Ligand binder design. Structure first.
Ligand code: GTR
Ligand code: CL
Ligand code: CL
Ligand code: CL
Length: 302
């Protein structure tokens, strides 16, 4: 069959878009040409929230979203969203590739989603019209976040005025001053054109919330076991491809925004980490969540 998958990003070569296209190529190979994936980027099939609901009801086969908008519907996705959980991108990758990530992926089935892969999304940092070097600088800042209660809390802990909005509304919001700031990785800051509106990128690195690729359980459950396995393998094998593309995009977008006049600022990251204890207290509240946070931070470096 020809499966459909959604992505919000406009660029046809954005790493997440390229990665699901690569997954499709692998699936064609593994299935002897039976199965294919068509990737609808440019939010053609809806916002992240909308596509999650379409996958839930089986109208859409796959969606590639960030964990943020999955925080309510698949609560263990909150774990890798948590601020300053991971010590480095290497730590994140090892954690997500191992038993922690695999358990989180499996946990979404209870809500109607087959979790297939985590893709890299770098670290998210504040961008605004002024430098945010300490948490005091963030006080009162009108900053967009994703549609997630955890995210509202995360940024509120900095003293900021968290403003949940869909991704597609952020560019115009920044241009018109409806919002002061937002937060994201550099490729998003670049490719969504947020850098056109605000130039100061303060490296708070306050989350490494990854992307998650999910399939509709309704659709998955009707496929033969052998074909379910092909899909899972193709997704898993696409992660290494996504990461190589992601590394390249990190560099390309950094060059783009520096050339465009962005001011990249180092910050007192401990200032921001020091306010996050209550976020763990208020969100990491179940045995599974506590166990998985601990497993992540018990992970040994290579
Ligand atoms: O902030 C957002 O809404 C966006 O952030 C990006 O990092 C992510 O790649 C998008 O899928 C979307 O979640
Ligand atoms: Cl395609
Ligand atoms: Cl969106
Ligand atoms: Cl944001």
């Amino acid at each position: 069959t020809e499966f459909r998958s959604a992505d919000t990003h406009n660029a046809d070569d954005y790493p997440t878009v390229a990665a699901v296209k690569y997954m499709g190529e692998l699936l064609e190979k593994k299935s002897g040409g039976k199965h294919k994936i068509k990737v609808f980027n440019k939010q053609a099939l809806g916002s992240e929230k909308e596509t999650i609901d379409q996958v839930k009801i089986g109208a859409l086969d796959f969606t590639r979203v960030n964990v943020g908008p999955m925080n309510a519907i698949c609560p263990l996705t909150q774990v890798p969203t948590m601020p300053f959980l991971f010590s480095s991108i290497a730590h994140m990758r090892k954690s997500l590739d191992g038993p922690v990530g695999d358990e989180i992926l499996k946990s979404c089935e209870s809500a109607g989603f087959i979790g297939l892969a985590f893709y890299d999304s770098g670290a998210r940092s504040i961008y605004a019209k002024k430098p945010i070097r300490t948490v005091a600088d963030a006080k009162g800042l009108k900053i967009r976040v994703q549609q997630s209660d955890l995210w509202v809390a995360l940024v509120s802990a900095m003293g900021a005025n968290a403003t949940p909005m869909p991704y597609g509304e952020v560019y115009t919001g920044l241009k018109t001053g409806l919002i002061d700031a937002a937060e994201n990785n550099i490729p998003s800051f670049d490719t969504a054109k947020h850098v056109e509106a605000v130039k100061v990128y303060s490296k708070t690195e306050h989350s490494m919330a990854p992307e998650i690729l999910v399939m509709s359980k309704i659709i998955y459950d009707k496929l033969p076991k052998a074909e379910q396995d092909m899909i899972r393998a193709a997704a898993k094998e696409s992660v290494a491809f996504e990461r190589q593309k992601w590394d390249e995009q990190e560099a390309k977008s950094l060059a783009n925004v520096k050339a465009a006049g962005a001011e990249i600022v180092e910050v007192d990251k401990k200032s921001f980490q020091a306010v996050m204890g209550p976020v763990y207290d208020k969100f990491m509240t179940t045995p599974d969540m506590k166990r998985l946070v601990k497993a992540v931070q018990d992970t040994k470096a290579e």
